[PDB]
Symmetry: D2
């Protein structure tokens, strides 16, 4: 699998568990087509979203459902979600670090 998502909780200093993630790919008509989805495990990681065969070149959007994560913990956060948009032309790790009013995201791209 060439695409992994990892999410951390900056309030607790812990993996962000059970975070829903939806991946979209831009279609030829310039609309966002559903591509894959899943949720983070107890380690805060989401593996197996796709395969090398399926993950063709394109423009991808990884939507991390941060609002649902915070609301399930009893917190009213600022953002609806965190959206990570990039073109793929190799392994991509999309990492996110979450706080109620702030997030950071980094891409680690390796061979």
């Amino acid at each position: 699998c060439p695409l992994m998502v990892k999410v951390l909780d900056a309030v607790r200093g812990s993996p962000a568990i059970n975070v829903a993630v939806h991946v979209f790919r831009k279609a030829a008509d310039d609309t966002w087509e559903p591509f894959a989805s899943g949720k983070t495990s107890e380690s805060g990681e989401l593996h197996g979203l796709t395969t090398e065969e399926e993950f063709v070149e394109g423009i991808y959007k990884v939507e991390i459902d941060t609002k649902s994560y915070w609301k399930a913990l009893g917190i009213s956060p600022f953002h609806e979600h965190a959206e990570v948009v990039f073109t793929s032309n190799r392994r991509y790790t999309i990492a996110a670090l979450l706080s109620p009013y702030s997030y950071s995201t980094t891409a680690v791209v390796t061979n």
Copy 2:
């Protein structure tokens, strides 16, 4: 003006100058409709995007064109742009500052919501 955008460059240690910013509001049909736009100033800030009259409660998307910023510096970036999506709330007086800190393969964003 109830909405301000501030952008910093973590590679140069500077304001991110002349970054394009496009703001959208979610319409009744669930599509994003254009709302306001501009480019950050010499201080990395974008003021005057809207007014209290127009900035009614809704879901807003602030799109920061990070890819073009890095390409103008001759630097290869990862993301197409940075998007900040939030619901505004009129529970009392409120100003929203959307702050972003940019690196080629990483960004952070924070909301500073004050009275």
Copy 3:
């Protein structure tokens, strides 16, 4: 004043108000000697720490007392404080803004160096 400190709270989405900040300069014997101190204002900023006359080239440490900030909010934090250590440089006119974004188990800091 060539040195400003700005602190934001990523949990509340607000300036970090009344945060203690202590600045030190490295002495000739390699110890940290006190240089300036204060507390952030209602805007999360600390102005007037020093003057161009006193802020000569050297190695400076800016210590931000994050632990006491979180404890005053009733929130359990990880770090004792956040420290920012850098060498100043008089190559032309220069102002340093040390910005910090705080969460209980994480922080980021950026230097904005302008003319």
Copy 4:
């Protein structure tokens, strides 16, 4: 080993390799005593700094030598180093994300 350090490079989107790390522990005389040191591997991680037996309660400082990292890559960075100071009373991962004029650090504390 109860203490791991992980470093990422936000310019390249890669692990930060060969980053020197020095850990200190506050002694009874309130001075910083050397505790352990090492450097990050090709994965950006530093394992085996200490043992459960050696890592007693105390105040620890993890100094990540960011200036030497950037200078070895031909870049003049802002900070001398990144310093992470915390009290230990369990596994600690100290993560850092580096840019020439900025860094972020997070603690992930697990059982």
